Design a protein around this ligand. Structure first.
Ligand SMILES: O=C(O)[C@]1(O)C=C[C@@H](O)[C@H](O)C1
Ligand SMILES: O=C(O)[C@]1(O)C=C[C@@H](O)[C@H](O)C1
Ligand SMILES: O=C(O)[C@]1(O)C=C[C@@H](O)[C@H](O)C1
Ligand SMILES: O=C(O)[C@]1(O)C=C[C@@H](O)[C@H](O)C1
Ligand SMILES: O=C(O)[C@]1(O)C=C[C@@H](O)[C@H](O)C1
Ligand SMILES: O=C(O)[C@]1(O)C=C[C@@H](O)[C@H](O)C1
Ligand SMILES: O=C(O)[C@]1(O)C=C[C@@H](O)[C@H](O)C1
Ligand SMILES: O=C(O)[C@]1(O)C=C[C@@H](O)[C@H](O)C1
Ligand SMILES: O=C(O)[C@]1(O)C=C[C@@H](O)[C@H](O)C1
Ligand SMILES: O=C(O)[C@]1(O)C=C[C@@H](O)[C@H](O)C1
Ligand SMILES: O=C(O)[C@]1(O)C=C[C@@H](O)[C@H](O)C1
Ligand SMILES: O=C(O)[C@]1(O)C=C[C@@H](O)[C@H](O)C1
Ligand SMILES: [Cl-]
Ligand SMILES: [Cl-]
Ligand SMILES: [Cl-]
Ligand SMILES: [Cl-]
Ligand SMILES: [Cl-]
Ligand SMILES: [Cl-]
Ligand SMILES: [Cl-]
Ligand SMILES: [Cl-]
Ligand SMILES: [Cl-]
Ligand SMILES: [Cl-]
Ligand SMILES: [Cl-]
Ligand SMILES: [Cl-]
Ligand SMILES: [Cl-]
Ligand SMILES: [Cl-]
Ligand SMILES: [Cl-]
Ligand SMILES: [Cl-]
Ligand SMILES: [Cl-]
Ligand SMILES: [Cl-]
Lengths: 139, 139, 139, 139, 139, 139, 139, 139, 139, 139, 139, 139
């Protein structure tokens, strides 16, 4: 179907001021533009609140919509986020802008990867665009 | 520039008979077709021999050409492969067809990821295509 | 005394749609019915927000009321939740609907168990009812 | 059906002289009284001999009768006990009188929990009674 | 410059009812009094909400103001908090009222210490005052 | 009372030629000046000899005088130093000039912290001055 | 010489009702038949009692007779069994019916293998027969 | 069917000059002789080249022929070898001439055992013969 | 008082045929002779049965008699033995004939030492005699 | 022969003001008295200096005299002390006054025990006397 | 005798374009020149193929010639290489050009060092020359 | 320049009575002779006192003279020694006479290697001579 949810977690609202010079609004505009090219509709949301993130994931579970998720630090710490993402019946693509394996050791474990469909790391902001293209070819 | 090397390691010659139903020749034809669309030239090679893989990586180092590398099992075991890939001055994108984080614990460490530019896992054969598209936008 | 607090953490609002087919409202009605049978009053609350959970625990600490707590994923990750529960002077019973020891290894550690009075796991929704009955016999 | 086996392992014969002031005979009389209230028949047995415990578990496997098991120290050490309990087709409820998570680190692993239906810890002698009530509601 | 942010995390609102008999309002009044003595202005804030804490840290990053941070339990669990604190360009002093090394083993790791300027533990409420004095000598 | 012992361990005699540009004699003069301001007497001693350090600690134990201790490398290696410091009945403040948590992993464990009153790290030479001020307020 | 002891440990009396459909008596009859073919005499014994197993091993030590040993769960837990088997001067062949390496991680360590002559796992009941044939060729 | 592949890995060409006095050609002649006795045909191959080993395993996968494999050092290091052996649909028997559990700790883990049918260790060269006999009884 | 229990666990009945050339009866006669010299009565018992050992320990707990215990392999494996020994109100001296620290790594942990009064290892059979002499001076 | 060296390491000079109320001089007088009873000569020495301890051990190595050694904290930290003690050709008995296994985890490893003849822990000051008696019976 | 084998493993053919500016041919010429000075003959070989390396080691084993070996990445990964080197009866000197202990943690373990005569690391290309000089003095 | 410091740590004064038959004075005479051949001056010092070793290292730091250091046991235990050696601006060569990797596991970690220029192990006393020759070629 058309709709794809792009969910960013804590601190991703500060993009542009490791993660590069593009701002979160620029990111939204890039995503929406690529999604229209692809025949999808992208709904892009960001929150520093875990409960707010869980609500958005819950809604994608009930609507059976795919999710492209950059959980930020919660990647490495939240079992609650993992359990909500485990209910999604449509694909889940875990995105990271930086290469989490070229940093601290503790960033090289994700609670999320074992239940995601796939993972894209280190490809910068284009990683989101590439995740979108995967989803457009997989319907 | 135009040229991109796609290097597959041991056992990837057997694709199609976890990794899906597409054969290695089909993979080559998909890659070459997408690369022409993108304005690149893809040189796709596969070997079960580590020394053969090292030679191909060496040549990409000397020519300063990017590499999209699916090292297979060597991902988790070869320091020699890592050291040769560390000499590449152009981007290196680590690809895995399956989600290595939804399998055995020992597949969740890569010698390669810390020196790659980025990593794509679990997106099937499309992961190669997406890696190509990253490289076409990054020249 | 009469009052018992039943606190559910993140994702437990979604019960019924591992954790079984009963909904969170059904759970509330089962608990309140069993508590009246037992001569207690049950106050049942659920939140995906850690701060909201901490507030409820704080209030039970100040009122010296017992707590039956199913913290969900926070069980395995929150030191903050643990520290607030450590102030309770009345009993704390840790409940889990599923058997956390028949799942992933990371679910077999609880920040909570060392400061709880006791723990009930794998007995489904009845675990809450049984926790209530323990508290009715222990006043 | 009516019958429930309550099996205590080594040292539980010494109850009453961490584990509280009730004796093993008092425990038997409490259990039998609660089981009659519930419409069940409780057969309560205790042994310091692992082979004797294995025989009792074997017999519950062949008769398809549920077991409430407090294995004492064997909880943390016996793979043999685990393997016999794994054959039970009726529910197995692991009971501990003390909170094993508020003690030594080595008491926080059980060979038994991964194959039990559920686990009750730290609720004192009432834990047995509560296990019985779970079984009476689950037939 | 004059301004110093003092940020307390979850449960620190309950001070006074390990952490001693002074209340959070008393703490605020002590800090403000010492800061005026020193020629600074202290802005003291407390929240049980991680997102609220992240917002305050974000604002100190944008204003280039120093932070004295007692994150409570989040010290040991939050990568998100760490990443926001890593953006601060002015000093960050990690404070703990209790000696975290004389307690549970899990309190002896901090996500925060590697990116802080310095750390003060076990000196009670005076630790905040001493952190202030460090900052007044370092401008 | 008036007297405070400031004990520096191996290599701290070389300060000034990570640890900054102030010399050990300058440090002594700074400490003595701040201690007089505070109404105390500071006795500052440095040795590369563990036995010499143990003797000084022994004497503070017998006199019931507080100690501010920067043990240098011995922090991470000496159980003997720990055991002598455990006899002190007056406060012990562990000081480190550098942030030991922003360095090698092996510097992030101290034999000393669990028996100290408190710990100050990364605040440079001022850490000693701040430790003094804690002791002047705590008599 | 002619005699070979075949010793089965706890739970192996229940064979036939992972370990397959053959019963312990059938196993005995298969072994005795193969041993006669080979010119040996097989003495096959089974016990759920560790002390009973130790006695049988002791007797093989004093008689200098080889042992084919399937210790069941005791494989992974008993140092006492290991020490008695270490006295055997004739060969000891450790047998397991299932593949212990395709199961839980804890089954992949044996106290016995380092002192055995050799080990056969995963070959079902034939493993015993093959162990016998090894011993008939090694006299 | 008749055919069984016996594959030896690196260094096994040097047998006879821990592993005993029989040469690799003697081993081949022993195997072929026992296989004819059993009504099978044994094809025995040895290589120090991992790629050569992978090719032989690939061919057994395509022909659906059983494999008796002594991978030598590759046992403990190769994920590539493991993945090729995982495709075999006929039985795989892992053989080791020495007892790998009476040696260095690092020899007590095999990448191969979890996907083999069964494993024979420490029975010398007879282990191959016994593996053959297992396969002759299992068709 | 006069009576001292000397309890030997599994395999110690075989002394004399690492542990030296003295037999268990010789050991008994040496102990009884030294105990009479010392004004005590020694009751020396040995069993390969854990339940039998637990019974003897239970009886020493009820009589408030000291125990000198060489548990053999059970030292390193039994939590049940530990828990029964923890009830003894008179001294418990753990004896080992061999030096358990000059052997396998797994012999360097004892479940028993943390609850014993003291431990004697590597002094051969004299260790028992020395334990007796400690008890004669400690009444 | 007659002579026995009793060597105490750091902090043991402070005995009497865990380790009990006897002073180091009292200890010396007790030892010398027991040694004369036994027909030996005891030379008792104590130092907080590792080099001084090494010299004394060196001299016992050259004279081939036994050593009873309580190294204090150095037990757990010094490889240098271990290597010098490894040269002794006469017996070495490691003594500890307290039970090192009922304390911190880090006290339960000794660099010394693997090269000692034997070890006595937790028997208080009598442990020295008992070590002497072992040596008098072993010449 | 005169002959010394110098064996370089994978990637060492690329020297000169961490490892410095000298090329592999320059290295060969330096070695041969120093070996003639010393009265030896140096045979210097390099391969990226493990099987090729094993063959060269095999030949040195059969000829009883010493080996100076820089295995590159295989140092840290190959058990096969280790086992072939373990057959050498003449000295084996492990050489590394860089300091492997000032790099990643995984480079600080060698499969080779425990069976080598000696190891030289971090001395650059001169390390080979120094290894030669050791061998010339040791015949 | 001409001068090279050769520093030996604890127990190396006892050479000659694992480490071979040459005495420390013989070692000094060998070193001085080789150093004169090379055009250097060797100053060779040995101490069992860590403080004495630190003083010598300090002096080499201030004079900018190279150091060849065999720290003995302190290699594996001293952070203080490491920190003083880290100040040296001229090369530091870590020498060990024995192969520390063919011994106990605990000898295979050095605090020193990560800050040394290079390391020579297992080449006996010649290792010192070879270290000298490295330094003569590196000025
Ligand atoms: O987009 C990223 O690279 C990242 O997910 C963002 C924040 C961090 O906490 C993650 O480690 C990486
Ligand atoms: O493409 C893959 O999924 C993989 O790289 C292939 C072979 C395996 O050894 C890797 O673990 C995953
Ligand atoms: O109720 C349960 O079973 C659970 O507490 C709920 C959510 C999960 O995160 C816990 O692991 C188990
Ligand atoms: O009932 C109990 O609390 C326990 O099962 C009894 C004996 C101990 O060994 C277990 O750890 C706890
Ligand atoms: O101030 C403190 O001591 C602390 O930061 C407060 C709450 C706890 O979670 C930390 O461990 C310590
Ligand atoms: O003052 C310091 O920062 C330190 O205590 C000095 C020397 C080092 O060994 C400690 O790690 C830190
Ligand atoms: O025969 C077997 O497969 C086994 O020895 C029997 C019982 C289990 O406890 C062992 O893990 C395997
Ligand atoms: O046959 C053997 O015993 C072995 O497989 C051969 C070579 C070694 O690397 C294995 O550890 C054992
Ligand atoms: O007496 C002994 O040395 C020992 O207790 C006896 C049997 C073994 O299992 C223990 O490790 C040591
Ligand atoms: O005698 C003792 O108990 C001890 O050896 C003395 C000092 C401590 O450092 C040891 O841990 C125990
Ligand atoms: O020569 C060296 O420094 C090295 O052996 C070469 C390649 C790397 O893989 C080793 O870690 C070091
Ligand atoms: O020279 C040596 O081999 C050594 O440095 C000397 C003493 C020991 O403590 C080191 O482990 C090795
Ligand atoms: Cl996970
Ligand atoms: Cl890595
Ligand atoms: Cl990844
Ligand atoms: Cl915990
Ligand atoms: Cl539990
Ligand atoms: Cl388990
Ligand atoms: Cl960290
Ligand atoms: Cl500690
Ligand atoms: Cl700290
Ligand atoms: Cl073992
Ligand atoms: Cl595995
Ligand atoms: Cl095995
Ligand atoms: Cl323990
Ligand atoms: Cl050790
Ligand atoms: Cl001990
Ligand atoms: Cl190794
Ligand atoms: Cl290090
Ligand atoms: Cl090394």
């Amino acid at each position: 179907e058309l709709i794809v949810n792009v969910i960013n977690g804590p601190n991703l609202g500060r993009l542009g001021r490791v993660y590069g010079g593009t701002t979160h609004d620029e990111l939204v505009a890039l995503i929406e533009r690529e999604a229209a090219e692809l025949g999808l509709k992208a709904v892009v949301r960001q929150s520093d609140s875990e409960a707010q993130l869980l609500d958005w994931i819950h809604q994608a579970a009930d609507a059976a919509e795919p999710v492209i998720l950059n959980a930020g630090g919660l990647t490495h710490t939240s079992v609650a986020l993992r359990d909500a993402c485990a209910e999604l019946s449509a694909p889940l693509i875990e995105v990271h802008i930086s290469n989490v394996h070229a940093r601290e050791e503790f960033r090289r474990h994700s609670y999320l990867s074992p239940i995601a469909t796939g993972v894209i790391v280190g490809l910068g902001i284009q990683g989101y665009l590439l995740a979108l293209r995967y989803l457009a070819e997989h319907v």
